[PDB]
Structures are given as structure tokens and as C-alpha cells.
Ligand SMILES: NCCCC(=O)N[C@@H]1Cc2ccccc2[C@@H]1Cc1ccc2c(c1C(=O)O)OCO2
């Protein structure tokens with residue numbers, strides 16, 4: 001559980017926002033890309049796994065699950081690649097809710113940035129710092145620190 | 150101390166590698182950019198501060214310290230921008246040593262990646278996971294978790 005992440009791909013302004021959510025905390029990292037490809041997904045996962053202890057990734061769709069480039073990145077980084085089938089059905093809804101909420105925040109900051117990528121990183125910041133009490137950033141650190149100990 | 154980061158800019162293959170080091174742990178994040186500009190530095194800091202609780206940044210040079218765009222990012226993200234003058238002289242040497250070491254790792258992985266950016270992220274991964282015993286990734290999580298508590 002400390003090591004479980006979920007990929008999520010959402011669309012805005014004709015572009016793609018690729019998101020990794022740390023399932024137990026709600027903490028996210030995100031990037032804007034022109035389109036979701038295996039190469040983009042592979043690179044994003046490499047970045048993520050260098051920054052946090054990523055043990056398992058629930059991939060967002062079958063194309064990324066199948067991608068030989070994504071499989072290579074997961075092998076390289078020591079990530080177990082799993083499907084993202086919401087056997088637990090409240091998973092879909094939790095992600096749909098996060099996407100709506102991310103887009104809401106993006107809209108709230110959108111006029112402060114010339115470029116979408118900047119607004120997305122502003123939204124990541126706001127999301128990870130928001131107290132709900134702990135923030136997602138606080139929860140992920142506590143979860144992993146408990147695991148190490 | 151849990152919130153103190155240092156910027157560092159180094160050169161390879163005609164490109165620039167921008168690094169943020171968490172001073173107390175040795176943990177890093179890095180990116181490849183064509184050249185160090187205020188805009189690139191500002192965006193990098195926004196990404197960093199959305200991912201970790203960045204309180205203070207020792208900027209890498211006076212151009213970034215002066216940059217109105219960097220100042221805007223630091224204001225937005227709640228970062229105190231400081232100079233990077235190594236009043237303590239072992240700071241310079243510690244960074245020089247990190248740059249040499251990062252470049253060493255990059256050379257060790259370089260043939261596994263078509264693009265420099267990929268090799269740099271591989272190097273970030275190896276650096277943050279290397280046990281020295283704890284790893285830098287373990288130390289940063291423990292430091293911040295102790296601070297929260
Ligand atoms: N020399 C052939 C490369 C070997 C190969 O296919 N996999 C690599 C091993 C590996 C391991 C982890 C992550 C990436 C990669 C690499 C793939 C790759 C994917 C995406 C990218 C890339 C490159 C890149 O190659 O830099 O660049 C930006 O987005």
C-alpha cells in the first residue's frame with residue numbers, strides 16, 4: 001500500500017494531462033503532453049519512480065499496459081505493472097472526481113499562467129497542499145516513513 | 150532545515166541539467182533544458198514546490214536570484230528565495246562533487262537511453278535509491294515526517 005500508484009489520463013484544451021495518484025494518500029504528480037503514447041508514459045513513470053518508492057502501478061488503459069516501452073520502463077525502475085481494472089467499483093468514481101476537481105482548480109488558476117502546463121503544476125501544488133486535518137503531501141510522507149521504520 | 154533546497158546548474162552534451170538538492174538529505178530532482186533562463190528556473194521551482202514542502206531555496210546564481218519570473222514563482226509557491234553564497238565553504242565542494250557523481254552515473258546509463266533527458270532521470274533514480282545505511286529518498290521522507298510530527 002505505501003508503494004501503490006494509479007495512472008490517470010484526462011483531456012483539456014486539446015491536450016492530455018497525465019496524472020499519477022498515490023492511492024493511499026491522494027497525492028499526485030502530473031504533466032501535460034500532446035498525446036498519450038507509450039514513450040510519454042514510460043518517461044513519466046521513470047521520473048515518478050526516481051522521486052518516490054513506486055512498487056506497483058495500476059496502468060490507466062490496455063494500450064499502456066501492453067506497450068513494450070512502458071514494460072521496459074517498469075522493468076528498469078523495478079515497478080510491478082498491473083491493470084487498472086476497478087475490481088473495487090468506487091475506484092472509477094474516485095478518479096472521475098479527482099479529474100473534475102483538478103479541472104476546477106486549473107480553471108481557478110488558468111488566467112494566472114500563459115501556458116496550460118504552468119496551470120497544471122499550480123493545480124498539483126494546490127491539490128497536494130490542501131488540508132482535508134492533513135494534506136495529501138503530509139499523508140504520503142507519513143505513510144512512507146511508517147513503512148521505512 | 151526540512152524545507153531547505155539548493156539549486157545547481159551543470160552542463161553536458163551542449164545542454165543544461167538543472168538540479169534541486171534537498172540539503173539535509175542529498176535527495177535530488179533534475180531536468181534537462183536547452184539553457185538556463187528565468188522562465189525555465191521558475192517552472193522547475195513550481196514543479197518542485199508542488200511535490201515537496203519547499204520553504205527556502207538557495208538560488209544557483211545572481212541572474213536567477215534577480216529574475217522577476219523566478220521571484221514571481223517563489224512568491225506564488227511561498228518560497229523564500231535566498232542567495233547561494235557558500236558562507237560555509239564546504240558547500241561549493243559538495244555540489245562540485247555531486248555534479249561529478251551525477252555525470253558519472255549518467256555515463257554509466259547513457260547507452261541505455263536514446264535521449265539525454267532519459268539518462269538524467271535514470272541517474273536521479275540511482276542517486277536517490279543508493280544506500281550509503283539509508284538512501285537519500287529514505288532520509289528526506291524521515292526528515293519531513295519528523296518535522297510534521
Ligand atoms: N537505445 C534504445 C533505448 C532502449 C529502450 O527502448 N528503452 C529505454 C530504457 C528505458 C528505461 C526507462 C525509461 C525509458 C527507457 C528508454 C526508452 C525511452 C522511453 C521514453 C522516452 C525516452 C526513451 C529513451 O530511449 O531515451 O526518451 C524520452 O521518452
Ligand SMILES: NCCCC(=O)N[C@@H]1Cc2ccccc2[C@@H]1Cc1ccc2c(c1C(=O)O)OCO2
Pocket residue numbers: 111112113114115116117118119187188189191192195218221222223225226
Ligand atoms: N499571464 C502572464 C503572467 C505570468 C507571469 O508573469 N507569471 C506566472 C505566475 C507564475 C507562478 C509560478 C510559476 C510560473 C508562473 C507564471 C510565469 C511562467 C513562468 C515560467 C513558465 C511559464 C509561465 C507561464 O506564464 O505559464 O510557462 C512555462 O514556463
